[PDB]
Structures are given as structure tokens and as C-alpha cells.
Amino acid sequence: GYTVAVVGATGAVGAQMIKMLEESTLPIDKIRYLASARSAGKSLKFKDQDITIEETTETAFEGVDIALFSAGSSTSAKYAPYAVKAGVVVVDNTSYFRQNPDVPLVVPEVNAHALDAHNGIIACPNCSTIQMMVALEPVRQKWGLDRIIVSTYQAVSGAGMGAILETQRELREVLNDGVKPCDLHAEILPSGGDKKHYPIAFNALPQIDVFTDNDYTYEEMKMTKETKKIMEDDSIAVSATCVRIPVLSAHSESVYIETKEVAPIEEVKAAIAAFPGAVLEDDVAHQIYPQAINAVGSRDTFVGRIRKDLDAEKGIHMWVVSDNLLKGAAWNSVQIAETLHERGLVRPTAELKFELK
Amino acid sequence: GYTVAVVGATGAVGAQMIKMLEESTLPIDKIRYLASARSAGKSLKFKDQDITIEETTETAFEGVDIALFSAGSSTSAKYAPYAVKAGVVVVDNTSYFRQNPDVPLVVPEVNAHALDAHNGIIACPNCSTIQMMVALEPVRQKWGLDRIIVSTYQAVSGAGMGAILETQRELREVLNDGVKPCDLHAEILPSGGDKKHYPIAFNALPQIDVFTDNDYTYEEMKMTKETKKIMEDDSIAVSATCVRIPVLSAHSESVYIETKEVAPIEEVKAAIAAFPGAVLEDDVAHQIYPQAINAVGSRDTFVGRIRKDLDAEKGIHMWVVSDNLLKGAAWNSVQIAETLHERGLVRPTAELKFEL
């Protein structure tokens, strides 16, 4: 089995990584936990055993086969290239390496073949992108895809533990203390990086991440660029609106597509039903459809409200839900590691393609 | 001046109806309140005076110039045709008369001209439709409209007072009592007229109203059929996804359009800013966009996030917000009554077109 390192083990983010690793089929001989100098010496569990946290350094990766990063961009940018130098295969959680042409950007049910030519780093995509790919892939491989228009309904856990706590506090202030939503004080949402903060309680904030020069946010642009790379077709037109709503976990998406040939709805339903990682939840006669609260805790991506557009003969609308911390992050990462092993691709890379810092 | 009646004053669809009437430019001599015999003897305030509630009957409408309905579809269906007969001009909030070709379906900024041929009843559109029309009409008249694709983020007050309270109970249970949202008991949402009920707390429910035979909901189909009637153009393609979210007041909408000719975004913004009833809230450098919580208490429709589609040359994306109880209902109704007064249309009807 492997020596596996979890880099950024201590966060709420790491905790999901650990849980998914604990339930993995990955043959694991040794687990190592890496984090900041602050956390080194402390103890976290892996299954029955107490694991001592080590400090993430340039030399910490010796003898490691697989490292799952679950921290931020700066940690990945600094330490991933050293891990590759040490002979590690890296599965990165962040946006940092995603648009690098030497880096496969992978959802294992969609483009596992992209893993074959990796150069030591495989990038896990954005959570909202991931669930859209699982839902749309079975459609694409039978009927093609010309364009996508998507509107998201994103949960606050996608912005971290702080955002969750902010949301709970604001809601209690409203419901228990009688404060008006417009009187609330926010510190984190819509974006911890950006200059201004707004209440999420009883609100809907059409900003996730910061704005780019073209007036779309990074989140919306990631949905555009990542789709193109995962499906290996730059000719797929994609435009998104990303909105934060007062949901703690699980993202929902309203998805419009136009296929390349007319896709009978009955067959679209059947193709999704038969697709790995996807679950058809569509029985409007009994009001069955994906719901954020039902998706929490599950690795699956749920699809429903599937229906023909009213005018465009190739247009299809649907509703796509998934736990943003599982399939949207930690599960897709662990699954990438399982798939690398499945395809015999856990090996040192001979040539370094990423500069050290 | 005018004797004006509020049918269904007892509900909280009438609460906002009263508040908009109190600040109206409408010359009101006598204000009357109508409801069922369940409350026909109590008291409710107009400005500072106390009003006797009367029973809604078949002959209670005599001497009334305008009646603003804010009850249920069944109340309108039975009592509005008597009001017309009596001499009243009816402004109906409900869906019941919306698709009747004898009933004008009006948002005053958009199609005031449709009021001219009224036959005693004017229909106020669905909330989500109303705010979308105010946002898109300035764009249609300069550059045309080919299609609309809309996804809504709709507030719970759209489904009544009982829905607001259910939402609060549920959130309080999650936060104070430790109940998992998947374990919450629900009785009203997604729809009071449907078989199963699901929690809205920390959820998003892709069902508003009940389902029709084409797998869209009636709410989705309203946005389609009503847009066609309001803009008087059946060729405009409209598909909708309507979603309930945990917000008490103010609907938000992600709106995509394709225009007939290319509309420069800069000009698109200026046209919206200059359109009555709409406010431009679009400055991404300082993170200015419409928000539900800022819109609560305002008659305006707020528009921002305006930007070109990345590939479709005539495609434009935007974000639209409005208080669903105001411009989405009460205000639009009062505004219609106001507009009928400006156009000389508050008078008894020539010929009766709805059966007694």
C-alpha cells in the first residue's frame, strides 16, 4: 500500500479529507498529517490510530507516494512542486494549478483518461463545476453539448467554517434578538478577500469570489474555463451567474443546455440514471426532485426537474444538487487518488515541470 | 372623489394593500373594507381613522368606484362579477382572470395602453413576472426581445403568511433546538395545494405552485404566458425555473435575454436607469448589486449584474430584485387604480362580460 500525506490536515476542510480517506479502498500502509508550525505536535485521528501532526516543509515529503492538499493557494504553490520533486503524486484541492496545461483537471467519471499523462499534479475542480460535469457528461456522450447557461444557489460552507458561523450568528440575531436583516454586521461574506461585507441571512448575494475585469466573478469564470478543459472542448459556450443563499451545505444549480442533437427526455433521464456518481431524482407526480438538505452527507450528484425547453428544440433545463464538501471537494479528491491507483499511475515523475519558490 | 373597497383586508395580502392606499395619490372620499362573516364587525385602521368591516356579499358593492381584491381566487371568481355589475372598476390580484382576453393584464410602466379597453376588471400579474417586465421593457423597446431564460430565487411571503411563520419555526428549530434540517416537519411549503411538504430551512426548493402536464410548474408557466400577454408578443420565447429559498421578503431573479439587435451594455444600463419604476444598482468595483434585504420596503425594481453573454452576441445576463408584496402585488394594484384615474377610466362598465 501507499504512504499518503494530507496537507492542511487541521482545518474543517482537512476533516472531510480525512473522513473520505478513512472510508477509502485505497491500500494505505502509512498516513502522515501535515500542517502549520502552530499545529505540529498535536494529535488527530486516522481510523483507530493517533497521528502526530508534522510541519509542512520543503523536505517533509520523502517516501510519500500520494499527497492530498486541503489548504489554500499559497501552500499548494509553495509545497506541491517540492512534493513532485520528492517523487510524490499530488492531488491539489485549490484553483492554483487548474489552468496549467501540464496539469490534468479531473472528475474521474468524466475525464479519467486525462490522468494518464500527468506530470505529478492533478487538480480537483471547483465544487460547482464538479456537480455540473457529473450531470451533463452522460448527456454529452450521447447527444453532444453546444452551450450551457447556469444559475447557482450556493451554500455558505463553500466559503469555509467562518462563513458558516457568520450565517448562524446572523440568523440567531434576527430570530432570537429581533435585529433587522439590513442592520446585521457581516465580516466574511460574500467574499473574505474583498473590501465590503454583507448579511447572508434572509438574503441572496449574487457574488461568489471577487470580480474580474469582464464583470463576471472568478467563480463564474471558473465554471466557464473548467468546463471547457474537463470536457476537452473549447467550443462549448458557457456562461454562469453564481449566487450565495442561506444554505449551510450542498449547492444547487439551475442548468440550461442545448445539445448537438435532439435528446428525448425519457432517454436523457435514463442516461443520467445509468451514469456513475449520478442519481436520477425525477418524479414530479410525487414532487421528487434534488433538495440540498437531502444531498448532505452523500457522495452522489442528484439530478431532476429534467424537461424540454418550451421553444428551443435542443434546449433542456434541469436541477442539479450535490454536497459541496464531498463530491464538490474531498470525495472528488480521494476519488482521483483511487482512480490514479486503479489505472496504475501512482509513480514518481522523472521531469519537474513546476518551479520551486 | 372615490369610494374605494379592499376585499380581503383581513389577510396580510391586504396589509400592504392598505399601506399603499394610505400613501396613494388617489382621491379617496370613503374607504371600505370587505371580508367574510368570520370578522364582519371588527375594526381596522386607514391612516388614523377606524373602519367598520362589512360582509362581502352580492349587493355590497353599490356606490363603490374601485375595488382592490386581495383575497383568494374563489372570492374573486364569485364576487368580482357582481362588483362590475354594480358599477365598480375591479383590480384583481389573483390569477383567476389573468388569461381572459376580456381582462387587461397590466404593469403600468409597461402596458398602460391596455387599460383603455377594459371591461370592468383589470388583472395584476404574478410577482416574479412583474419585476421582470419593469427590468426588461426598457430593453425591449430599444433593441427587441427574442427569448428569455429565467431562474428565480423567490421569497416565502409569496406563498402567504402561514409560509413566513413555518419558515421561522423551522429555522428556530435548527438553530436553537439542534434539529437536522432533513428531520424538520413541514405543513405548507412548497405548496399548500399539493400533497407533500418539505422544509425550506437551509434548503432550496425547485417547486413553486403545483405541477402542470408539461412538467413545468404553474408558476413557471405563468411567467411564460403572462410575459406574452403583457408585452403583447407571442413570439417571445420564455422558459422559467422557479425556486423557493429561505428569504422572507423580496424576490431575486437571474435573467438571461437574447435581444433582436445588439444592445451595448453601457447603453443598456442608461436605458434601465431612465425607466420609471426601475433603479440601476450596478457598480461591481464597489460591489453594488441588487439585494433582497435592501429592496424590502421599496416600490422600486432593482437591476444590476448586467453583462454580455460570453458567446451569444445578443445575449445579456442580469440580476433583478423587488419586494414581492409591493411591486409584486399591492403597489402594482394601487398603481393600476392610480393609472385608471390618470387615464379617465374610473367609470361604470358599458357591457357585462363575466357571468353572474
XYZ file of C-alpha atoms in Angstrom:
713
model
C 0.000 0.000 0.000
C 0.931 3.665 -0.057
C 2.337 6.352 2.173
C -0.288 9.136 1.983
C 0.047 12.684 3.272
C -2.832 15.003 3.981
C -1.518 18.558 3.696
C -3.694 21.004 5.667
C -4.979 18.267 7.989
C -6.244 20.541 10.811
C -8.900 22.652 9.072
C -12.596 21.814 8.749
C -11.538 21.142 5.126
C -8.938 18.556 6.199
C -11.502 16.811 8.406
C -13.620 15.965 5.335
C -10.492 14.773 3.532
C -9.630 12.535 6.494
C -13.167 11.103 6.654
C -13.177 10.315 2.922
C -9.687 8.744 3.236
C -10.819 6.669 6.240
C -13.609 5.152 4.100
C -11.431 4.733 1.004
C -10.471 1.442 -0.684
C -7.004 2.896 -1.236
C -4.394 0.499 0.094
C -2.730 2.632 2.799
C 0.375 1.488 4.689
C 1.195 4.835 6.274
C -0.678 8.069 6.889
C 1.041 11.378 7.594
C -0.580 14.660 8.673
C 0.989 17.945 7.623
C 0.016 21.463 8.727
C 1.398 24.803 10.005
C 4.105 25.150 12.697
C 1.306 26.086 15.139
C -0.337 22.635 14.894
C 2.800 20.468 14.819
C 2.936 18.145 17.831
C -0.838 17.926 18.192
C -2.792 14.727 17.561
C -5.522 13.899 15.026
C -7.166 10.514 14.397
C -6.883 8.279 11.385
C -9.343 5.452 11.976
C -8.210 3.895 15.299
C -4.725 5.488 15.467
C -3.412 8.791 16.849
C -1.456 10.701 14.184
C 1.080 13.336 15.223
C 0.863 16.426 13.003
C 4.114 17.439 11.282
C 5.113 20.837 9.926
C 4.661 21.263 6.158
C 8.160 21.926 4.784
C 10.218 21.522 1.590
C 11.717 18.274 2.926
C 8.582 16.811 4.535
C 7.615 14.682 1.507
C 10.313 11.991 1.466
C 8.898 8.494 0.956
C 5.391 9.871 0.259
C 3.525 8.324 -2.670
C 0.365 10.444 -2.647
C -0.286 13.836 -1.092
C -3.783 15.269 -0.824
C -3.614 19.037 -0.318
C -6.551 20.607 1.565
C -5.270 24.074 2.416
C -5.046 27.273 0.409
C -3.366 28.502 -2.751
C -0.128 29.643 -1.154
C 0.524 26.249 0.472
C -0.048 24.490 -2.867
C 2.084 26.937 -4.871
C 4.986 26.589 -2.419
C 4.928 22.918 -1.486
C 3.394 20.954 -4.375
C 6.470 21.389 -6.623
C 8.689 20.118 -3.780
C 6.391 17.120 -3.328
C 6.697 16.340 -7.059
C 10.486 16.724 -6.768
C 10.400 14.120 -3.943
C 8.555 11.634 -6.208
C 5.042 12.254 -4.856
C 1.855 12.291 -6.949
C -0.131 15.406 -5.878
C -3.872 15.843 -5.818
C -4.473 19.592 -5.306
C -7.764 20.997 -3.963
C -7.178 24.647 -4.910
C -7.625 26.711 -8.057
C -3.876 27.332 -8.243
C -2.796 24.659 -10.779
C -6.162 24.192 -12.518
C -5.479 26.127 -15.739
C -1.883 24.888 -16.071
C -1.596 22.870 -19.339
C 0.766 20.372 -17.649
C -1.924 19.710 -15.046
C -4.901 17.410 -15.633
C -8.145 18.876 -14.217
C -10.202 15.825 -13.394
C -13.623 14.471 -12.459
C -12.951 10.684 -12.524
C -16.338 9.754 -14.077
C -15.809 12.254 -16.890
C -12.132 12.515 -17.948
C -10.110 9.841 -16.066
C -8.172 9.406 -19.324
C -6.586 12.859 -18.741
C -4.825 11.319 -15.706
C -2.634 9.104 -17.965
C -0.253 11.915 -18.927
C 0.031 13.725 -15.553
C 3.312 15.388 -14.556
C 2.941 14.883 -10.767
C -0.013 17.187 -10.044
C -3.694 16.524 -10.649
C -6.132 19.321 -9.883
C -9.547 18.834 -8.296
C -12.028 21.252 -9.990
C -14.296 23.883 -8.361
C -17.231 22.306 -6.458
C -19.965 23.917 -8.544
C -18.215 22.821 -11.731
C -17.863 19.226 -10.486
C -21.559 18.502 -9.949
C -22.450 20.072 -13.278
C -19.964 17.763 -15.052
C -21.348 14.593 -13.465
C -24.885 15.557 -14.501
C -24.009 16.703 -18.027
C -21.395 14.135 -19.103
C -23.875 11.261 -19.806
C -25.914 13.735 -21.858
C -22.865 14.943 -23.835
C -21.576 11.456 -24.742
C -24.855 10.543 -26.464
C -26.119 13.903 -27.799
C -23.243 16.391 -27.563
C -23.162 19.845 -25.977
C -23.217 23.226 -27.750
C -23.820 25.585 -24.803
C -24.619 25.860 -21.094
C -26.292 28.625 -19.123
C -26.201 28.037 -15.369
C -27.525 29.868 -12.287
C -26.238 28.621 -8.910
C -27.710 28.527 -5.425
C -24.532 28.026 -3.406
C -24.172 27.057 0.236
C -22.094 29.074 2.689
C -19.854 26.101 3.585
C -18.129 26.653 0.227
C -16.595 29.772 1.831
C -15.340 27.972 4.956
C -16.117 27.421 8.651
C -16.126 31.180 9.354
C -18.856 31.766 6.769
C -20.995 29.038 8.397
C -20.587 30.632 11.827
C -21.376 34.077 10.369
C -24.603 32.711 8.859
C -25.747 31.015 12.103
C -24.979 34.096 14.236
C -26.810 36.465 11.818
C -29.862 34.204 11.746
C -29.966 33.995 15.582
C -29.616 37.782 15.812
C -32.682 38.096 13.552
C -34.824 35.305 15.025
C -33.827 35.478 18.718
C -32.843 39.146 19.137
C -35.199 40.903 16.679
C -32.445 42.663 14.690
C -33.449 43.603 11.149
C -31.529 41.777 8.367
C -30.412 45.162 6.959
C -28.959 46.080 10.416
C -26.710 42.982 10.621
C -22.917 43.239 10.738
C -21.031 40.906 8.393
C -17.277 40.208 8.366
C -16.801 37.481 5.737
C -19.499 37.102 3.056
C -19.816 37.426 0.136
C -16.016 37.165 -0.055
C -13.375 37.220 2.673
C -10.865 38.722 0.218
C -12.999 41.657 -0.959
C -13.426 45.118 0.598
C -17.101 45.044 1.627
C -19.193 42.530 3.527
C -22.957 41.909 3.533
C -25.509 39.845 5.533
C -26.430 36.453 4.085
C -29.397 35.927 6.489
C -32.705 36.095 4.573
C -30.630 37.336 1.614
C -29.326 36.211 -1.771
C -25.915 37.567 -2.763
C -25.018 37.451 -6.468
C -21.304 37.447 -5.741
C -19.073 34.485 -5.091
C -15.352 35.276 -5.108
C -14.157 38.675 -6.400
C -14.945 40.392 -9.705
C -12.810 40.018 -12.833
C -12.318 42.713 -15.487
C -15.241 41.431 -17.652
C -17.797 41.837 -14.794
C -18.195 38.116 -14.164
C -16.828 36.809 -10.867
C -13.935 34.335 -10.636
C -16.408 31.677 -9.578
C -18.472 32.232 -12.721
C -15.306 32.328 -14.859
C -14.018 29.112 -13.260
C -17.275 27.437 -14.244
C -16.654 28.651 -17.820
C -12.942 27.745 -18.114
C -13.002 24.473 -16.131
C -15.935 23.006 -18.061
C -14.038 23.659 -21.299
C -10.944 21.783 -20.022
C -12.736 18.844 -18.314
C -14.820 18.102 -21.399
C -11.852 18.882 -23.679
C -13.891 21.130 -25.952
C -13.151 24.865 -26.058
C -16.131 25.287 -28.409
C -18.662 24.712 -25.597
C -20.162 28.096 -24.850
C -20.613 28.522 -21.079
C -21.872 31.497 -19.047
C -22.744 31.470 -15.353
C -24.341 33.555 -12.576
C -23.131 32.453 -9.133
C -25.300 33.339 -6.114
C -24.886 32.691 -2.390
C -28.055 31.780 -0.452
C -28.660 30.984 3.274
C -27.990 27.226 2.923
C -25.244 25.669 5.061
C -24.295 22.705 2.902
C -24.965 21.488 -0.672
C -25.056 23.567 -3.821
C -27.984 23.577 -6.167
C -27.828 24.656 -9.786
C -30.426 25.618 -12.339
C -28.889 24.302 -15.564
C -29.847 25.105 -19.152
C -28.178 23.300 -22.031
C -28.531 22.955 -25.768
C -27.336 19.610 -27.083
C -25.918 18.943 -30.563
C -28.825 16.619 -31.464
C -32.360 16.370 -30.028
C -32.195 14.325 -26.821
C -35.507 12.587 -25.923
C -36.217 13.409 -22.263
C -37.024 9.782 -21.374
C -33.585 8.782 -22.677
C -31.818 11.736 -21.025
C -33.386 10.592 -17.755
C -32.216 7.010 -18.449
C -28.674 8.071 -19.392
C -28.298 10.054 -16.141
C -29.807 7.163 -14.150
C -27.176 4.833 -15.605
C -24.274 7.269 -15.094
C -21.730 6.561 -12.272
C -21.890 9.106 -9.446
C -25.224 10.461 -10.684
C -28.672 9.709 -9.296
C -31.891 10.492 -11.096
C -34.415 12.059 -8.716
C -37.214 12.981 -11.086
C -40.847 12.084 -10.450
C -42.782 15.348 -10.468
C -46.073 13.443 -9.995
C -44.832 12.764 -6.452
C -42.827 16.029 -6.182
C -39.492 14.225 -6.342
C -36.504 16.426 -7.094
C -32.991 17.026 -5.699
C -33.019 19.013 -2.415
C -29.914 20.485 -0.745
C -30.871 19.114 2.690
C -31.322 15.554 1.325
C -27.986 15.661 -0.500
C -25.886 16.441 2.598
C -23.706 13.503 3.702
C -23.911 11.816 0.278
C -21.229 11.375 -2.415
C -23.816 11.351 -5.200
C -24.847 14.078 -7.563
C -28.636 14.335 -7.855
C -30.461 15.408 -10.996
C -34.123 16.273 -11.576
C -36.639 18.787 -12.940
C -35.481 17.499 -16.348
C -37.621 18.957 -19.101
C -37.543 20.175 -22.699
C -37.222 23.910 -23.282
C -40.550 25.425 -24.416
C -39.172 26.837 -27.680
C -35.593 25.717 -28.442
C -35.850 22.177 -29.780
C -32.426 21.164 -28.433
C -32.710 23.125 -25.175
C -33.002 21.188 -21.900
C -33.459 22.539 -18.354
C -32.521 20.652 -15.194
C -31.826 20.965 -11.447
C -28.562 19.632 -10.061
C -27.645 19.236 -6.362
C -24.579 17.905 -4.527
C -22.780 18.210 -1.193
C -20.107 20.820 -1.968
C -17.658 19.350 0.595
C -17.871 15.717 -0.568
C -18.165 15.297 -4.313
C -17.540 19.052 -4.573
C -14.184 18.684 -2.830
C -12.899 15.941 -0.524
C -14.617 12.980 -2.213
C -13.580 14.073 -5.722
C -10.001 14.324 -4.374
C -9.896 10.921 -2.707
C -11.645 9.502 -5.821
C -8.889 10.994 -8.012
C -6.365 9.130 -5.800
C -8.335 5.875 -6.100
C -8.534 6.344 -9.881
C -4.780 7.027 -10.141
C -4.184 3.743 -8.312
C -6.861 1.954 -10.390
C -5.052 2.933 -13.606
C -1.541 2.182 -12.290
C -0.490 5.822 -12.345
C 0.969 6.359 -8.867
C 4.660 6.792 -9.751
C 7.483 9.347 -9.436
C 7.606 11.880 -12.301
C 11.111 11.972 -13.848
C 10.902 15.546 -15.155
C 9.931 18.502 -12.957
C 7.653 20.972 -14.762
C 6.800 23.295 -11.879
C 9.262 25.836 -10.500
C 10.316 25.857 -6.849
C 9.774 29.002 -4.717
C -63.817 61.761 -5.047
C -63.911 57.960 -4.917
C -65.337 55.262 -2.672
C -62.689 52.508 -2.663
C -63.102 48.961 -1.295
C -60.441 46.481 -0.115
C -61.764 42.909 -0.457
C -59.799 40.547 1.790
C -58.474 43.212 4.150
C -58.183 40.555 6.904
C -55.192 38.787 5.290
C -51.637 40.157 5.085
C -52.044 40.489 1.321
C -54.392 43.305 2.363
C -51.958 44.640 4.991
C -49.656 46.014 2.315
C -52.702 46.933 0.187
C -53.824 49.336 2.944
C -50.330 50.855 3.428
C -50.059 51.633 -0.317
C -53.586 53.117 -0.275
C -52.694 55.431 2.640
C -49.868 56.995 0.612
C -51.807 56.991 -2.682
C -52.372 59.999 -4.957
C -55.891 58.616 -5.382
C -58.730 60.974 -4.303
C -60.486 58.824 -1.687
C -63.729 60.057 -0.065
C -64.829 56.827 1.620
C -62.682 53.795 2.368
C -64.462 50.459 2.776
C -63.155 47.100 3.952
C -64.700 43.782 2.913
C -64.168 40.208 4.144
C -66.135 37.105 5.259
C -68.676 36.907 8.118
C -65.757 35.466 10.150
C -64.752 39.054 11.021
C -67.610 41.279 9.758
C -67.922 43.553 12.815
C -64.337 44.280 13.921
C -62.124 47.342 13.293
C -59.088 48.193 11.137
C -57.253 51.493 10.588
C -56.967 53.585 7.433
C -54.305 56.204 8.253
C -55.697 57.112 11.718
C -59.472 56.544 11.365
C -61.086 53.247 12.412
C -63.063 51.361 9.750
C -66.055 49.047 10.228
C -65.525 45.732 8.406
C -68.577 44.673 6.397
C -69.521 41.286 4.922
C -68.621 40.523 1.295
C -71.981 39.981 -0.454
C -73.544 40.159 -3.934
C -75.019 43.661 -3.343
C -72.360 45.166 -1.027
C -70.609 46.921 -3.922
C -73.139 49.681 -4.735
C -71.664 53.208 -4.704
C -68.105 51.820 -4.818
C -65.914 53.228 -7.610
C -62.887 50.929 -7.254
C -62.432 47.579 -5.517
C -58.937 46.188 -4.929
C -59.168 42.441 -4.382
C -56.600 40.804 -2.073
C -58.326 37.544 -1.124
C -58.346 34.121 -2.770
C -59.103 33.034 -6.327
C -62.537 31.749 -5.221
C -63.543 35.128 -3.724
C -62.639 36.940 -6.946
C -64.390 34.315 -9.109
C -67.735 34.829 -7.348
C -67.713 38.432 -6.077
C -65.867 40.382 -8.811
C -68.622 39.822 -11.449
C -71.149 41.405 -9.059
C -68.862 44.377 -8.434
C -68.656 45.005 -12.200
C -72.452 44.786 -12.484
C -72.868 47.282 -9.598
C -70.697 49.869 -11.405
C -67.295 49.262 -9.794
C -63.926 49.013 -11.556
C -62.178 45.886 -10.262
C -58.424 45.475 -9.799
C -57.831 41.766 -9.118
C -54.593 40.452 -7.618
C -55.301 36.734 -8.126
C -54.571 34.538 -11.171
C -58.232 33.767 -11.911
C -58.840 36.405 -14.628
C -55.278 36.747 -15.962
C -55.650 34.719 -19.201
C -59.162 36.006 -20.040
C -58.942 38.051 -23.292
C -61.559 40.471 -21.837
C -59.248 41.248 -18.906
C -56.251 43.594 -19.371
C -53.105 42.288 -17.616
C -51.180 45.379 -16.585
C -47.889 46.636 -15.212
C -48.448 50.408 -15.632
C -44.888 51.327 -16.722
C -45.042 48.675 -19.441
C -48.531 48.475 -20.969
C -50.682 51.344 -19.627
C -52.443 51.441 -23.029
C -54.142 48.079 -22.360
C -56.263 49.727 -19.669
C -58.194 51.765 -22.268
C -60.286 48.800 -23.479
C -61.060 47.336 -20.026
C -64.453 45.741 -19.317
C -64.615 46.363 -15.554
C -61.816 44.025 -14.454
C -58.068 44.605 -14.573
C -55.687 41.841 -13.506
C -52.469 42.308 -11.598
C -49.772 39.832 -12.771
C -47.770 37.266 -10.794
C -44.965 38.816 -8.597
C -41.994 37.317 -10.407
C -43.406 38.354 -13.777
C -43.970 41.966 -12.675
C -40.381 42.767 -11.631
C -39.007 41.073 -14.770
C -41.238 43.221 -17.016
C -40.096 46.504 -15.400
C -36.472 45.405 -15.884
C -36.776 44.181 -19.482
C -39.311 46.564 -21.096
C -36.750 49.410 -21.423
C -34.533 46.904 -23.239
C -37.276 45.510 -25.495
C -38.392 48.883 -26.869
C -34.865 49.892 -27.927
C -33.449 46.519 -29.038
C -36.324 43.986 -29.046
C -36.670 40.643 -27.274
C -36.303 37.212 -28.833
C -36.069 34.998 -25.782
C -35.893 34.961 -22.006
C -34.421 32.278 -19.787
C -35.076 32.917 -16.106
C -34.215 31.244 -12.821
C -35.852 32.732 -9.739
C -34.881 32.912 -6.071
C -38.289 33.573 -4.568
C -39.171 34.634 -1.029
C -41.552 32.656 1.210
C -44.098 35.504 1.695
C -45.099 34.833 -1.914
C -46.782 31.707 -0.526
C -48.735 33.550 2.218
C -48.494 34.456 5.908
C -48.537 30.797 7.029
C -45.393 30.204 4.958
C -43.474 33.031 6.701
C -44.275 31.536 10.113
C -43.405 27.973 9.056
C -40.031 29.211 7.829
C -39.306 30.990 11.109
C -40.405 27.972 13.193
C -38.120 25.704 11.138
C -35.039 27.932 11.344
C -35.569 28.427 15.094
C -35.734 24.627 15.466
C -32.465 24.091 13.594
C -30.608 26.838 15.422
C -31.955 26.621 18.987
C -33.123 23.001 19.295
C -30.441 21.197 17.291
C -32.804 19.623 14.754
C -31.278 18.494 11.441
C -32.990 20.279 8.528
C -33.693 16.898 6.839
C -35.660 15.960 10.033
C -37.903 19.058 10.128
C -41.695 18.634 9.887
C -43.360 20.843 7.264
C -47.038 21.516 6.537
C -47.224 24.298 3.909
C -44.205 24.636 1.610
C -43.564 24.042 -1.259
C -47.338 24.436 -1.904
C -50.463 24.425 0.291
C -52.392 22.974 -2.655
C -50.045 19.996 -3.069
C -49.757 16.571 -1.364
C -46.270 16.528 0.160
C -44.494 19.151 2.224
C -40.761 19.729 2.642
C -38.692 22.044 4.905
C -37.425 25.334 3.427
C -34.855 25.977 6.169
C -31.341 25.793 4.720
C -32.907 24.376 1.577
C -33.794 25.477 -1.948
C -36.982 24.019 -3.395
C -37.359 23.905 -7.207
C -41.181 23.905 -6.860
C -43.489 26.871 -6.618
C -47.200 26.285 -7.111
C -48.250 22.836 -8.413
C -47.061 20.906 -11.476
C -48.764 21.057 -14.878
C -48.850 18.352 -17.574
C -45.671 19.605 -19.336
C -43.519 19.145 -16.154
C -43.147 22.904 -15.607
C -44.955 24.336 -12.555
C -47.904 26.711 -12.883
C -45.647 29.486 -11.564
C -43.135 28.772 -14.325
C -45.951 28.679 -16.878
C -47.369 31.985 -15.548
C -44.027 33.716 -16.253
C -44.194 32.354 -19.798
C -47.879 33.014 -20.615
C -48.066 36.351 -18.736
C -44.943 37.833 -20.377
C -46.513 37.094 -23.768
C -49.766 38.877 -22.786
C -48.101 41.927 -21.134
C -45.562 42.632 -23.898
C -48.264 41.691 -26.487
C -45.963 39.371 -28.423
C -46.450 35.609 -28.604
C -43.128 35.140 -30.466
C -41.026 35.929 -27.378
C -39.649 32.587 -26.143
C -39.852 32.194 -22.351
C -38.794 29.319 -20.118
C -38.547 29.546 -16.366
C -37.226 27.665 -13.371
C -38.906 28.852 -10.149
C -37.156 28.186 -6.859
C -38.136 28.885 -3.246
C -35.273 29.943 -0.955
C -35.115 30.833 2.773
C -35.852 34.551 2.343
C -38.957 36.139 3.927
C -39.428 39.064 1.548
C -38.218 40.209 -1.877
C -37.781 38.012 -4.957
C -34.497 37.840 -6.816
C -34.152 36.654 -10.450
C -31.251 35.533 -12.630
C -32.426 36.746 -16.043
C -30.947 35.884 -19.433
C -32.139 37.569 -22.600
C -31.387 37.494 -26.267
C -32.289 40.746 -27.987
C -33.283 41.201 -31.647
C -30.346 43.537 -32.388
C -27.099 44.001 -30.392
C -27.547 46.222 -27.343
C -24.360 47.820 -25.932
C -24.245 47.194 -22.143
C -23.358 50.797 -21.302
C -26.495 51.953 -23.192
C -28.498 49.094 -21.637
C -27.644 50.449 -18.170
C -28.594 54.037 -19.067
C -31.957 52.909 -20.513
C -32.795 50.960 -17.358
C -31.713 53.845 -15.097
C -34.029 56.225 -17.019
C -37.001 53.841 -16.923
C -39.709 54.685 -14.342
C -40.101 52.086 -11.581
C -36.585 50.702 -12.107
C -33.373 51.590 -10.290
C -29.927 50.721 -11.594
C -27.759 49.211 -8.879
C -24.707 48.263 -10.889
C -21.186 49.099 -9.740
C -19.105 45.939 -9.295
C -15.954 47.937 -8.333
C -17.668 48.778 -5.018
C -19.730 45.531 -5.048
C -23.030 47.275 -5.761
C -25.803 44.950 -6.967
C -29.448 44.377 -6.051
C -30.018 42.568 -2.750
C -33.316 41.221 -1.363
C -32.776 42.759 2.093
C -32.239 46.276 0.740
C -35.305 46.030 -1.507
C -37.727 45.289 1.371
C -39.998 48.313 1.903
C -39.381 49.889 -1.513
C -41.716 50.180 -4.521
C -38.759 50.046 -6.959
C -37.361 47.183 -9.038
C -33.573 46.963 -8.649
C -31.355 45.836 -11.534
C -27.631 45.078 -11.688
C -25.001 42.434 -12.541
C -25.704 43.492 -16.158
C -23.223 41.935 -18.577
C -22.813 40.439 -22.063
C -23.041 36.672 -22.618
C -19.558 35.278 -23.302
C -20.580 33.756 -26.667
C -24.094 34.690 -27.796
C -23.636 38.134 -29.296
C -27.213 39.222 -28.459
C -27.180 37.547 -25.053
C -27.255 39.611 -21.863
C -27.280 38.438 -18.226
C -28.699 40.430 -15.297
C -29.941 40.323 -11.679
C -33.399 41.659 -10.722
C -34.837 42.233 -7.240
C -38.096 43.629 -5.855
C -40.332 43.417 -2.758
C -42.860 40.754 -3.816
C -45.603 42.212 -1.646
C -45.152 45.729 -3.045
C -44.357 45.984 -6.773
C -45.007 42.233 -6.879
C -48.575 42.726 -5.600
C -50.041 45.559 -3.504
C -48.226 48.528 -5.095
C -48.879 47.311 -8.678
C -52.586 47.012 -7.839
C -52.776 50.502 -6.314
C -50.671 51.874 -9.196
C -53.194 50.386 -11.668
C -56.003 52.153 -9.790
C -53.914 55.338 -9.953
C -53.294 54.916 -13.703
C -57.014 54.253 -14.384
C -57.630 57.612 -12.669
C -54.990 59.411 -14.755
C -56.463 57.997 -17.997
C -60.152 58.727 -17.255
C -61.162 55.084 -16.911
C -62.751 55.019 -13.457
C -66.381 54.799 -14.564
C -69.072 52.070 -14.732
C -68.780 49.449 -17.483
C -70.855 49.631 -20.681
C -71.421 45.884 -21.137
C -71.204 42.911 -18.734
C -68.861 40.150 -19.950
C -68.485 37.871 -16.893
C -71.370 35.583 -15.876
C -73.390 36.113 -12.690
